[PDB]
Design an enzyme around this catalytic site. Sequence first.
Site, PDB file in Angstrom:
ATOM      1  N   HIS A  68      54.741  85.822  61.058  1.00  0.00           N
ATOM      2  CA  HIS A  68      55.302  87.067  60.455  1.00  0.00           C
ATOM      3  C   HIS A  68      56.742  86.830  59.982  1.00  0.00           C
ATOM      4  O   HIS A  68      57.666  87.573  60.370  1.00  0.00           O
ATOM      5  CB  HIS A  68      55.177  88.199  61.468  1.00  0.00           C
ATOM      6  N   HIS A  72      55.350  84.542  54.821  1.00  0.00           N
ATOM      7  CA  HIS A  72      54.296  85.593  54.814  1.00  0.00           C
ATOM      8  C   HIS A  72      54.681  86.689  53.814  1.00  0.00           C
ATOM      9  O   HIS A  72      53.843  87.115  53.025  1.00  0.00           O
ATOM     10  CB  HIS A  72      54.083  86.168  56.215  1.00  0.00           C
ATOM     11  N   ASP A 107      56.935  93.507  56.374  1.00  0.00           N
ATOM     12  CA  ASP A 107      57.003  93.049  57.792  1.00  0.00           C
ATOM     13  C   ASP A 107      58.459  92.773  58.171  1.00  0.00           C
ATOM     14  O   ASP A 107      58.693  92.009  59.081  1.00  0.00           O
ATOM     15  CB  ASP A 107      56.126  91.826  58.043  1.00  0.00           C
ATOM     16  N   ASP A 217      47.871  91.588  52.525  1.00  0.00           N
ATOM     17  CA  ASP A 217      48.271  91.245  53.899  1.00  0.00           C
ATOM     18  C   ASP A 217      47.314  90.244  54.526  1.00  0.00           C
ATOM     19  O   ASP A 217      47.786  89.479  55.363  1.00  0.00           O
ATOM     20  CB  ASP A 217      48.348  92.478  54.776  1.00  0.00           C
ATOM     21  N   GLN A 269      37.088  84.202  64.670  1.00  0.00           N
ATOM     22  CA  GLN A 269      37.262  84.201  63.196  1.00  0.00           C
ATOM     23  C   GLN A 269      36.003  84.769  62.527  1.00  0.00           C
ATOM     24  O   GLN A 269      36.165  85.667  61.687  1.00  0.00           O
ATOM     25  CB  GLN A 269      37.648  82.796  62.716  1.00  0.00           C
TER      26      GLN A 269
HETATM   27  C1  LIG Z   1      46.560  91.657  59.597  1.00  0.00           C
HETATM   28  C2  LIG Z   1      45.410  91.113  60.436  1.00  0.00           C
HETATM   29  C3  LIG Z   1      45.625  89.804  61.149  1.00  0.00           C
HETATM   30  C4  LIG Z   1      46.780  89.974  62.097  1.00  0.00           C
HETATM   31  C5  LIG Z   1      47.984  89.207  61.647  1.00  0.00           C
HETATM   32  N1  LIG Z   1      46.766  90.703  63.199  1.00  0.00           N
HETATM   33  N2  LIG Z   1      45.762  91.385  63.758  1.00  0.00           N
HETATM   34  C6  LIG Z   1      44.513  90.974  63.825  1.00  0.00           C
HETATM   35  C7  LIG Z   1      43.527  91.894  64.512  1.00  0.00           C
HETATM   36  C8  LIG Z   1      42.367  92.301  63.841  1.00  0.00           C
HETATM   37  C9  LIG Z   1      41.401  93.171  64.339  1.00  0.00           C
HETATM   38  C10 LIG Z   1      41.563  93.670  65.589  1.00  0.00           C
HETATM   39  O1  LIG Z   1      40.600  94.464  66.178  1.00  0.00           O
HETATM   40  C11 LIG Z   1      39.701  93.744  67.067  1.00  0.00           C
HETATM   41  C12 LIG Z   1      42.733  93.308  66.343  1.00  0.00           C
HETATM   42  O2  LIG Z   1      42.792  93.877  67.614  1.00  0.00           O
HETATM   43  C13 LIG Z   1      43.975  94.602  67.926  1.00  0.00           C
HETATM   44  C14 LIG Z   1      43.708  92.437  65.807  1.00  0.00           C
HETATM   45  C15 LIG Z   1      44.040  89.685  63.160  1.00  0.00           C
HETATM   46  C16 LIG Z   1      43.005  88.942  63.762  1.00  0.00           C
HETATM   47  C17 LIG Z   1      42.502  87.751  63.240  1.00  0.00           C
HETATM   48  O3  LIG Z   1      41.542  86.963  63.796  1.00  0.00           O
HETATM   49  C18 LIG Z   1      40.986  87.414  65.050  1.00  0.00           C
HETATM   50  C19 LIG Z   1      43.004  87.237  62.042  1.00  0.00           C
HETATM   51  O4  LIG Z   1      42.384  86.081  61.648  1.00  0.00           O
HETATM   52  C20 LIG Z   1      42.710  85.730  60.285  1.00  0.00           C
HETATM   53  C21 LIG Z   1      44.007  87.946  61.380  1.00  0.00           C
HETATM   54  C22 LIG Z   1      44.509  89.176  61.923  1.00  0.00           C
HETATM   55 MG   LIG Z   2      52.720  93.953  59.639  1.00  0.00          MG
HETATM   56 ZN   LIG Z   3      51.979  91.309  57.120  1.00  0.00          ZN
END
Ligand SMILES: CC[C@H]1C(C)=NN=C(c2ccc(OC)c(OC)c2)c2cc(OC)c(OC)cc21
Ligand SMILES: [Mg+2]
Ligand SMILES: [Zn+2]
Length: 315
Positions: A68, A72, A107, A217, A269
Amino acid sequence: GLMQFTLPVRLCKEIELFHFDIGPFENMWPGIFVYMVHRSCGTSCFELEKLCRFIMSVKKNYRRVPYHNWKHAVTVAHCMYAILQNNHTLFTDLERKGLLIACLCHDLDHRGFSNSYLQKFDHPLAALYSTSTMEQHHFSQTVSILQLEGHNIFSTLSSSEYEQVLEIIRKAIIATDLALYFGNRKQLEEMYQTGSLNLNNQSHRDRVIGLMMTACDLCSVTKLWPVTKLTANDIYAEFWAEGDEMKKLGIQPIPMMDRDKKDEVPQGQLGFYNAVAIPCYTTLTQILPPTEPLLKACRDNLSQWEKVIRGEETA
Ligand SMILES: CC[C@H]1C(C)=NN=C(c2ccc(OC)c(OC)c2)c2cc(OC)c(OC)cc21
Ligand SMILES: [Mg+2]
Ligand SMILES: [Zn+2]
């Protein structure tokens, strides 16, 4: 006024593609962003001197966290650029101006921790903002920087054009709260399928801009496999640090954030591509057909993760 930014030939051509990687030379990222503003918006949108001072203050207020970070910010802005350039006539002058700025700022001052971790830590920002905790902070930081002397890149707008663009930016940054994504996309799916989707309805535009913000994003999943795979490393490096902090509060983290459960990443994933990424780029392709390469690249990376699981390649 007569001062174009130009990029070397390979960048000049690849920057137009959705799967462009901005590269490891940090010092070119401001140039890349100005290039995108100029081609997306015009050489007249912003005073170069004010824009440059704004970009560098924004850069300075991103932290040295694994994912972040400033890279990004620029990456997410480039995906918005790609969407805007492939959908020339659908967006107002104000939307083009505000959205590239929203993505650059989305961010600001991120610490590498989720809303959930701030809430369980009892972070002061969790008392100030009960929902979309970091996103309301990112917008707070954006307005702060806009108000520094010499940094008002919107100074030429009317009192009310100025209010409209800060309102575009605010909704665009709030929409990057992935908890809000699920309902937003459900609604857009129903509106599109029952024929009620109307881009003249401001509240429909708003929802469609939210979906773009989610798409931009998440754009890590829409790159060539070696970029996607190496980015997933940065992403999980933050998740596992948050996991460690959860354990320091005496809370088992979710497996995503548990570094003792690295083996579950490939299956994690898969869930993410199926539950979030594919649905996001599917609905986006339905509303904006020229964004289909994002869906195509996403599908390719799901297939690469399936291959990782079948041991037909190591990460
Ligand atoms: C912007 C989305 C991005 C992130 C930076 N942060 N949050 C989650 C996430 C998603 C869904 C969720 O719900 C289960 C969650 O839980 C709080 C968390 C995330 C999970 C990933 O792989 C697992 C991922 O892989 C590319 C990328 C992301
Ligand atoms: Mg953010
Ligand atoms: Zn972001």
